[PDB]
C-alpha cells in the first residue's frame, strides 16, 4: 500500500565539501587564560568549588589555550603557545598539555600536515568549541604520557580527554582517526555535541548546535558519539569500533539527524546505535551495526517519527533492533540477521510500521512485540512517561530460520499482517 521511504541525499557530505565551510581570510587571536573566566568551561565543570580536580591535573591555577576573533589552525597555536603547553614532539606530532577552547567567534582548523594531535590525559587536556571547528585528514587521540600511548580504557571514572561542542556551534570532522576519548562524566563522553544547560540557554539563546562527522574512525571511546538538543547533525561513513558503552548515542530532544552508512561494531557494554529521549524525525539508514554487547540499533524513550531503513543488523548479543516506548516509527527493509535474541523487538510502542524487513536466524523470535508495566523500576516516569500498549502493521519482507519462531506479539492492541513471507 505504501511507497519506498524518501531518504536524504548523502552525495554532498564530503571531505572536499567540508573544507569550504570556514572563514580563513581573517585571523586570528590566541590567548592562554584562566578556565573559570569562560562560560564554555564553567558550563560543565560548574562553580569555582569544582576546580580542584583541574588544579591537580595542571598543578596550578587552571588554564586553557583560547582561540577567538578569527581563524587559527593547529600549526598557528604551536608557533604562539609555549612548548610546555603545546609541544611538537616530532614532525607533525603534538602533545597538548592544556585544554583547547574555541570561543564563540573563534574558528579552529586541524588539516592534514598534522600527523597526530595528542591530548594529554595526565594534564587534563580536552577540546571545547563554542564556534567554528574543522578537522580533516588527521588524528586526535587521548594520550597517556606515562604509558606513552593511547589512554586505553580501564574504569568509568578515570578521566580521559574528550571533545565537546556547545550551543550555537558548527563542527565538521572528516577523514579523521580518534581513539580512547571520554569517561563517565557529564558532557565528557567522547565526542559530544550539546546545547547549553537549560538555565544558560535561557540567557544566551544560541541556536541548537550542528555539524557533520564523516568518513572517520572512532575506537575505544566511552561513547562514540553523543548529542543533546542537536539539530540536523550528519554522521556518515564512519567506523565505530570497540567503544565501551555506546557506538552512536544521540540523545535528549535532538531532531533531523542523518546517521548513515556507518559500520558500528564491537561495543563492549551496551548498544551499537541508540537514539534516546525524544530523538525525533531522524534517519537511520544503510548502516552495518553488528557484534555489540547488547542491541544493534535502539530507539528509546518516546523517540518518534523516525525512519530506520536498509540497515545491516547482525550478530548482536541481544536484539537486532529494539524499540522501547517509541511509537510512530518506520522500519523499512532492514536485514536483521543472526542476533542472539530477537530480530526486531517492540516494547510498549504503537503505530510501528514494519515494511519489507527480513529477519533470519535470530536466536529467538524474528519479531517480538510486548508490553511491560514500568512503574516500580528506576525509571523517571515524570520525565519519560510510557503507555503500555503495542500495535504494529507488518507488510512484506520475510521471517525465517529464527530459533523460537517467526513472530510473537503478546496482548497487542492491534496487529495487521499483509503479504509477509514465513518459512
Swiss-Prot record:
Catalyzed reaction equations: [(1->4)-beta-D-mannuronosyl](n) = [alginate](n)
Phenotype upon changing residue 249 to A: Retains 5% of epimerase activity
Pathway listed: Glycan biosynthesis; alginate biosynthesis
GO molecular-function term, one example from the UniProt record: isomerase activity
GO biological process: alginic acid biosynthetic process
UniProt key word Transmembrane: no
UniProt keyword terms in alphabetical order: Alginate biosynthesis, Isomerase, Periplasm, Repeat, Signal
PbH1 repeats: 230-252, 254-277, 279-301, 303-325, 326-348
Descriptive protein name: Mannuronan C5-epimerase
Organism of this sequence: Pseudomonas syringae pv. tomato (strain ATCC BAA-871 / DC3000)
